[PDB]
Design a protein around this motif. Structure first.
Motif: not given
Length: 338
Positions: A56-65, A98-113
């Motif tokens: 599965e493809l995940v997303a990792i948001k690393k912010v300065l904790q 680090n925040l391991v989140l579900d990964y989703v390629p498309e966004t409403v923005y991209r589609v609407a654009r």
């Protein structure tokens, strides 16, 4: 901590012990590969990766904790479990957070654009599908008194085939408590509610509804409905359509010739009941969901142009319907009761 080995045919492997997003703290070995710096938000870095096992493809948001306090986003997401909100698979620390989140390629923005560039327009069925799911996600987090505060096309992730949408990026989310004041510079330009523009600090989570109405109106128009480089400009556009605000309308702060022709009149109606000067006059997420504009979604024979079935739209919870339980008589369609 994290261990990074390289086995299984020339490939870097990162192994770490993290904590389940939801559930009791019961650490686990999480191994992913193919980490690529897909995003570079502001607060930190956004990484995209592949879990070695499921693939599965995940997303990792690393912010300065920081140790100076708890991480509000982490805390908020730690308590959300809804089919329309990105899922927090795991979370862990690195030398920061680090925040391991579900990964989703498309966004409403991209589609609407995409459609907007091709001087084309998105089939209303998707408009209904997407907007509905967003309103549901809003009713859910609102039920916990949590306001997203940054509802915008880009924070609406979506699976191209299933058509399921998921609200993401809660880095601006906050549980609002009556009496307690809040910063009024947290919303995106084209989606800030008039109150935010007027600098109100006693706004209610209904600012999420205004934004949503902006997403909807934008989907139907092909461009933002209230743009402007400055507040003054933004207000001009808002007024041009809603009409000058009355004295009362303001105190509470702090159509037919707008959309293209042949555009459903239910859609235009909903927009008007979402974009109101009076914050307390805007429909609630659940009321938005039960609007006639979403009747097609309730039809038993509806499917995606795709031929596939629509994602779940009626598997409501007590948590979800709490704002107004009796709305379930409209929200949950007959065939769904078989």
């Amino acid at each position: 901590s994290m261990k990074v080995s390289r086995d299984k045919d020339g490939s870097k492997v990162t192994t770490v012990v993290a904590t389940p997003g939801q559930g009791p703290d019961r650490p686990q070995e999480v191994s992913y590969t193919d980490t690529k710096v897909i995003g570079n938000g502001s607060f930190g870095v956004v990484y995209q990766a592949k879990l070695c096992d499921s693939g599965e493809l995940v997303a990792i948001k690393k912010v300065l904790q920081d140790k100076r306090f708890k991480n509000r986003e982490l805390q908020i997401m730690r308590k959300l479990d809804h089919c329309n909100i990105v899922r927090l698979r795991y979370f862990f620390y690195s030398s920061y957070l680090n925040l391991v989140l579900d990964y989703v390629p498309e966004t409403v923005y991209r589609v609407a654009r995409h459609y907007s560039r091709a001087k084309q327009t998105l089939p209303v069925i998707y408009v209904k599908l997407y907007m509905y799911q967003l309103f549901r996600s809003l009713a859910y987090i609102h039920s916990f008194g949590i306001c997203h505060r940054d509802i915008k096309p880009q924070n609406l992730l979506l699976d191209p085939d299933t058509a399921v949408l998921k609200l993401c990026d809660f880095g601006s989310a906050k549980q609002l408590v009556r009496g307690e004041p809040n910063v009024s510079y947290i919303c995106s330009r084209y989606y800030r509610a008039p109150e935010l523009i007027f600098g109100a600090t006693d706004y209610t989570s209904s600012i999420d509804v205004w934004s949503a109405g902006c997403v909807l109106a934008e989907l139907l128009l092909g461009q933002p409905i209230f743009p402007g480089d400055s507040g003054v400009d933004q207000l001009v556009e808002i007024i041009k359509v809603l009409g000058t605000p009355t004295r009362e309308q303001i105190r509470e702060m702090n159509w037919t010739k707008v959309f293209r022709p042949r555009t459903p009149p239910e859609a235009i109606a909903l927009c008007s009941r979402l974009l109101e000067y009076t914050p307390t006059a805007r429909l609630t997420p659940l009321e938005a969901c039960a609007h006639s504009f979403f009747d097609e979604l309730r039809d038993p024979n509806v499917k995606l142009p795709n031929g596939r079935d629509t994602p779940a739209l009626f598997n409501f919870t007590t948590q979800e319907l709490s704002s107004n339980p009796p709305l379930a008589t409209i929200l949950i369609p007959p065939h769904a009761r078989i």
